[model samples]
Target chain A: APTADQLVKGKNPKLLVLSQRPIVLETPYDLLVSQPERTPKEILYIRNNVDLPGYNTVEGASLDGWKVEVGGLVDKPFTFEAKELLELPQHEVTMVLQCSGNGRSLFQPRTSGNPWKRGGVGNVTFRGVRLKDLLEAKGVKLGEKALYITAHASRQGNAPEFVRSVPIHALGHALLALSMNGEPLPAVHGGPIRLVFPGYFGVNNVKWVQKIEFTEAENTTAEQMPRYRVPAIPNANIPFLPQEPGKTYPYSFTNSRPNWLVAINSFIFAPLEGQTVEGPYVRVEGVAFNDGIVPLVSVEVSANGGRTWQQARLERQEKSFGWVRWQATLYLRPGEHEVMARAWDAVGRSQPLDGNIAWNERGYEYNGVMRVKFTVAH
Target chain B: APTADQLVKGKNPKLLVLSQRPIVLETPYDLLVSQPERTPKEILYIRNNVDLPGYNTVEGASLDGWKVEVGGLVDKPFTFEAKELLELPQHEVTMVLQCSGNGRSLFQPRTSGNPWKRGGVGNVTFRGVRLKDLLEAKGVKLGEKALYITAHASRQGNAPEFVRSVPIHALGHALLALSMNGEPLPAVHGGPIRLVFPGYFGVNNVKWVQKIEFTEAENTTAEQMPRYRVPAIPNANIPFLPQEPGKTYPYSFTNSRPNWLVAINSFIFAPLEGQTVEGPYVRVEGVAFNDGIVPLVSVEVSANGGRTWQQARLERQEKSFGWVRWQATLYLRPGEHEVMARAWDAVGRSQPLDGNIAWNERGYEYNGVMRVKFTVAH
Candidate 1:
């Protein structure tokens, strides 16, 4: 098989490349904070499941004739031409697109996926025709359980198409985003049309979306049914622990469900690892976000490795389901110091310590404590 | 000037495009932990200072005709063909390559540059001929101050050719990396031959080597002299408090000096933000690195907001100038929790709290205490 590097060469230099085959790139978190206005389309984090379709194909499909198939259990299934879709009342949402495995690397015993660290997320305003409106136009009716989505990725051998499903009830909130950050979607980021699962992980918001199926059961493909599902108890000893590298999980937790909500988490962007500093005090800065299921109540920073805590003032208090940039000032005389931050949802659910995180075969749901060590020079 | 999205229409879907013109990309840090082995050549982080030369030109120049000119203050001047350079004893080092302005976005009144974040750093094993050997072969002698280098970006208006110089005395440790991880350097990453300033910021490592000048003074181009240099005392009051977009810094501090060594720093990779936990205790994991000048003595973690600290056990007992992985365990009951980390160098320098960091126009050297915020669920 040709490697991603072989297929796609000379990528943007700003992205922190994680893998070539699957092609996962993360945005520099600081870039998200620096530009308070909009998330640069270029620097937006990328999560590609397969090598980009050939350039000519991408360009070929990028024409105005591009149509999104709206079939699957609808009363009147119809396709959406780019123009027709554009004619609908376009809605927009300023939300975050985070990888479900944003912190997969932090999982103990190490898990699979891209092993994403801090950069696997981005906050952006997506503008496009809402799925609800389109579905209503097609008179699409929802089933009892879910709606499966199939993205455009040519079939390759036994590899399954990247597919997933959300609750059928979520159709109203889903948007077939045509533009991100006020520009037409680029092919690299699901161009012609992509689904925006507001406040959902990047995977849930499938790219290059082609088909939206109203289904009683989620797509049965490995990607939809088992790949992203986490065990109910996160037992490493669960059957099929550490699913085969290329193969799909043979057994999944009985209660396993599609990853829906994003865990609450935050990261320190300023005072990065090993940055030098002078002495009056340190102003720690970072951003905190939740699954958009609940509002983030408070963010706290600890300068002495969690020995004490101080509230970080929240900035970007615009809307829910978006990241809130926050800062805290810690007074330290000098010498070595450590800082940590944690966020709480309205329900009081906060992040767990690293060790306390349960081990899963896939290394999902890792919202553990984050810490950084740096030197303070006089 | 067309936007990067317009210029580079379809890049590898995986690369996080920061800008289109110069094209800078960072690797997802979690990918570093995902692959315990070689860094994939495809996803290798890219930091381009200029537009990629035409493909034909790149391909044409990739042949044996590609030569590295060594003529600066030398007894003998010579241009080594690609083959000749490859014949020299190749050395390898698994070290980190980071951008100087990695956390620049974290700066309040944010500074310019790529606005990189933590993703701007990558750890990879570089396989390449040594600059020392090439210098020796050319009978090149060191100057009193620095050694200037010029890369392959063509002439463009006021845009100074991407050039930089490093302390001549440090050449012994510099590498003319022909290959990274195991693959030939991609044209995107200063391929064919690029300098690797081990333990230095990415700026010092010039790509697309075209010339090496033995000089008493560093390169005088804006990129070489004023751009990469930081103030002796960081001042937010600089004329360009934070450089204007697409503009150079005006009134740079007279005492500014080139960014040389990396500051001491560490981060907790596990217990990532928003990761759910079973709770009782949490384990912390991460890595620490320095400027290759000092060894990391210890890393400590705290669970209670820094009320106390416990030493984290070191995992990779390796050499200096490279990252050392470490881990720790923390006990916690439940509820919201914060974990913080700090590291001590052999010389006793440790990270200061965020407030201790001084404000700078360029947002350089920001090694303040690091923190993460998460919730603990019962």
Candidate 2:
């Protein structure tokens, strides 16, 4: 079997490269089918229902009177001046934004939400200040169990404006994204200040955000109230739960739940449409990532489809907050190959090889292992 | 013997009387020869300290220019506006105050210090805000190992100003006194702002205080550097203490040395100068306090000087903080009479009858019991 680079370069491989486009996760379809070597732009998967018009300032528009109202669990209530908010010490952090739809698009029979093919997940090397440092500098107490962060853009009429509830403890790792991939964020992607959720789904990464309010109650926004139901529990554990074990999911207990492993799936790049190939010694590789905890566990390859497999060499040790690369070399007498990859972390749990459990009412946290089929020529 | 009031009035009539003035302390002649019943108007105890000038009018001193500078273990260094601070929230607490030198004049050999004689201690209830509340409100992320707080008074000084370093974790009980004795504090005290140290000594209770600084290092100020040192143990586990222990005091860990009570003693408060008296029953009473963790064990009285003894009823339960009162009723036979009272706290270290111990350099924490003589006439 010819290595991945052989398909593109048609010779002894310099690099078994895949797609070269910057990944910009589009639909669930793109995510399910995106190839390796993707640019942020070509990546599949997207947070649908998100409106991105109100946050950024227009060419001639002036924000001379921008204000952020704050109240709840405090002695005094007042609005914060934009300048004042900016004036507080700004501490920068680099965070990888994981969209809930990152792996859901790969679910079989297709989920109802955005059909994120693949690539909907982007390792956004984002640069922005911590929202918490600002809130606390302005007097946010840790004793406050929860904080409601609602972003309001200049434009109105969006019912219930973009709102979300983040645990106060979770905010320590969250960021109000200002730049992406080492540059100031573009307007389309929450330019002035958009919340780049640390490890939540794209739905939680509200865009075109403007107004942020601090409240003591659980988030009751229309967009969040309904779908904010807890992460789905493994069906096995459902029956043993203290509460009713119906289809309705429970709200995520930020610190209680064990890390859920989304599988180490992969995809085929160009040379599409059932292209045939000759077999010989070849090499295969791909990348993997997890939400906020450890990255991919391990990547394995199989030249004889799913019949037999070999573990791939990992590129880096487990990272607490980012993505990792996994690659391997294989020999093949291949006409075509079926490859599989799976991930595991510090915790014992690993991504499931089967995709049956990936289904959720809203299709979130689908981390079942993935398979990619391709042809190689000698 | 007659009761305190009965003897003071020389009204009791039984058999024979040696003098007037009942309820005499066991230790006669140990009387406060310098001042008696020091009129509250010129109460030498409370009047000795300089009074602070009072600031009238709530002319809303604009702290707009006032800046709270924060440093150490923080990512961003910044100042917050006073208005901004108020907008955070208000937290309040109540506490009490007692002077450390309350029983100073009672020192044996008459140590050179303020002559409090009696009525030296006054308990004032205070209602104000806590110091910790403001620290958290301003986003002070006290380091785990150590957090030091030094409060600065608005009044500037070139010398080792009156700031005291307190461990952040120990500050929950400290107060930023706003009101005293159910009324605004007198300027002579701290008035607008004073620190009400709940259970600490008077020196630690700073008055007229203002700014407070946070530090991660132990304060090396002149006040704390060499002033406070506890005796050091020669061996880790008393492996082999020197028989003739040399004077060596260590400056760490507080030792539970005896507080106030030293020997079983009492005093003669009545039977003024050479008066004769006769009585049926008289009352004897005095105050006993412990310095360290030791508790007062008992109080005994003797009518024939040091000949025989009788137990006295405790006026109240042993209070871990503040003073304890003990009293006993004695039947008098007229003629000359001697009375004595003794007490011990929980430490099981009863007051010594007459034996003396080596006087360490620091002549503090002296707890010798008291004794005196008196008479009743018919």
Which candidate number has the best TM-score? 1
Off by over 4 Å in 1: A1-11, A28-37, A55-63, A143-160, A233-253, A317-319, B1-378
What's model 1's lDDT at A71?
Answer: 65
* Model 1 vs truth, CA RMSD: 26.6
Cα error, residue A53 of model 2, in Å, equals 4.2
Query: Residue A289's C-alpha lDDT in candidate 2?
Result: 55
* C-alpha positional error of residue B318 in candidate 2 after TM-score superposition, expressed in Å: 70
**Would you list the C-alpha lDDT of every candidate in the order shown?**
0.62, 0.43
Residues A245-298, model 2: lDDT tens digits: 125454442201222222233332323335564557555556655444434434
lDDT of 2 by residue, B1-378 (tens): 543223322111221222222111111122232222211111111321323233322111233454444444444445543334445444443221233343344444443334343333333455566656666765665554435556555553332355566544336556766555555544434555566555454545666565556666445554443332212221111101111123434332222121111122233344333556566777766555433232344455666643334656655554333345556777887666666554533322233332112122332222234455556766
Model 1: per-residue lDDT, tens digit, B168-208?
54565888787766766666666667778777777777766
- How many pairs of residues collide in each model? 65, 103
Individual DockQ of the candidates? 0.01, 0.01
lDDT at position B350, candidate 1: 49
